[PDB]
Amino acid sequence: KEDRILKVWTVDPLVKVFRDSEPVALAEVARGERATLQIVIRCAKPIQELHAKVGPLALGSNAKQVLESAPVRFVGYVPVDRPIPRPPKDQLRRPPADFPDPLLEEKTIAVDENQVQPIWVTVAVPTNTQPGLYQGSVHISGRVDGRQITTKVPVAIKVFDIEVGQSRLWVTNWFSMQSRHMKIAPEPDSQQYWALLSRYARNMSEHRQNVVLVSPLSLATFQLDMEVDFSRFDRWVRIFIAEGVIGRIEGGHLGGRSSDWESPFVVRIKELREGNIITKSVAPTSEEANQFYAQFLPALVNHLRDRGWLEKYAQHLADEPVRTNIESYRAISKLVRKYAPELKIIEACHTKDLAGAIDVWVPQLNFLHNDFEHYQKRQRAGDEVWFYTCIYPQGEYANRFIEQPLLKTRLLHWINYRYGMTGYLHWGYNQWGKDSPFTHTTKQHTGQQYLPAGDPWIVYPGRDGPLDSIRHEAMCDGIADYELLSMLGERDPEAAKRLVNRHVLDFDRYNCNVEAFRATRLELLELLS
């Protein structure tokens, strides 16, 4: 006894806890938000069978009014072996190091001696929850050198009388339908395939994603005697509607680069060749491109209109146009404008010189900063402007890299509010490679640069569906923050400016002080309640 005492403390969930962190639970939320509590343990001896149970979280005026807690999850660690090449000053530690990120879904875990272990508690608070102060405890148990150890940790959730429903922010995370590294491996069109697709869709809507990228080329079949069959595309759309994502439908890219970074764009077509439908890439000004798109685009518009989906849809042309391939990009736009004038066009862009060619602009964050007057004008002209991050920007800009403070993920959506950008895009929902994402955090193809840890995936492969990361949680919370700030700004625009300006000081400069952030959140909640 003494070496068996369990050290327990509570840490703000915006603070990343490392295996060697030193010791230091209340959450404050609107109805409609998710409350997170992070409870951290350490023991001088190994622990077997660590388990936590959330007791009833009850209203003091009425023990009958209880919040429903999700199953408890354990914070998992991943080896970040190589760093962001241009890191921020506030980089949490220098690689190589083990960082907290995946939220594991295990009933029990082992802890090695002297290793700090976070326990992550999520309480989703429905909009119809009665406001007030909910209290209870988390019962932690396990076995240390024979003996059963146990402790209860007091926790409290204050539920403010303000309702956050759907966030008006548009959010897309590009998703690949794949079961790599899972304990299941469904084939396409199997029941389990569609069940997994549903589980992914639910995970996305539970994290306030309300846009999904679906390809009308890849998920259609063609007969070319043209007849287009959209039945697989439709199954996807109905799943994403039913699980509460759609929202909007983001049509997959029609084309891409012919070769290298500055090469011209080509567009995919379908052709009948020797009895088979083949796909090939052609110049957008070609007769082959004109013949295909003159039939495919009207078929797509008719289909969407007939299904009541046309006003929810926007079509991608080709990703990340730059100044040197602008002509071929615009030639793709001309095809769409000609055969499908009713279709809205969306693009993740670098070049700004696309007025009339696209309707939903998605500049990379640093390009938005640099070309801000351009993008404000496009909004005045009636276009939508969102933004993205990826491998870039690095430096001091906000992003969702594992090396960054977790507030840099959450404050992405404060950048949306401050600057009036009405959506956010990211390529990297679940782009796992052939190596495990748990043990190989810096994805890399041979002869090209590695991706910083955090960039290609924000969820991890569980046994039969996605596991969240702590960054997925922070992203969801930021999307709810944007809705709160938007509700405030309708009543009191000056108070919403003051609050956002506390944390978003410029495009590339923030206040990530977690205590300051909590005091801002509380003022927001108090002003709105």
Author numbering: 27 to 50, 55 to 255, 260 to 563
What did the authors write?
Despite low sequence similarity, the crystal structures of these enzymes demonstrate that all enzymes share a prototype structure and have diversified their substrate specificities (oligosaccharide-releasing, oligosaccharide/monosaccharide-releasing, and monosaccharide-releasing) through the accumulation of mutations and insertional amino acid sequences. The overall structure of these enzymes is similar to that of CpNga123 and BvGH123, which consist of a β-sandwich domain at the N-terminus and a (β/α)8-barrel domain encompassing the catalytic region.
We used deep-sea metagenomic sequences to discover a β-NGA, NgaDssm, which is the β-NGA to possess dual OR/MR-type-β-NGA activity and low sequence similarity to known MR-β-NGAs. Assays using various pNP-substrates revealed that NgaDssm was active on GalNAc-β-pNP but not on GlcNAc-β-pNP or GalNAc-α-pNP, indicating that the enzyme possessed exo-β-NGA but not exo-β-HEX activity. Furthermore, the enzyme hydrolyzed Galβ1-3GalNAc-β-pNP but not Gal-β-pNP, demonstrating a oligosaccharide (including disaccharide)-releasing (OR)-β-NGA activity in addition to monosaccharide-releasing (MR)-type (exo-type) activity. These findings suggest that NgaDssm is an OR/MR-β-NGA. The active site of the OR/MR-type NgaDssm from Group 3 has a cleft structure that enables passage to the −2 subsites, as in NgaCa, but it also possesses two additional β-hairpins from the second and third β-sheets of the (β/α)8 barrel domain (purple). The structure of NgaDssm (Group 3) bore a striking resemblance to that of NgaLy and NgaP2 (Group 4) (root-mean-square distance of Cα atoms [rmsd] = 1.5–2.3 Å), while the structures of NgaLy and NgaP2 are identical (rmsd = 1.0 Å). The increased number of residues could potentially reinforce substrate recognition in Group 4 and GH123 enzymes. Additional structural analyses (comparison of crystal structure with AlphaFold2 predicted structure of NgaCa, comparison of apo1-form and apo2-form of NgaCa, and comparison of GalNAc-thiazoline-bond form and GlcNAc-thiazoline-/apo-form of NgaAt, NgaDssm, and NgaP2) data are illustrated in Supplementary Fig. 13. These results indicate that NgaDssm and NgaCa are anomer-retaining enzymes, similar to GH123 enzymes.
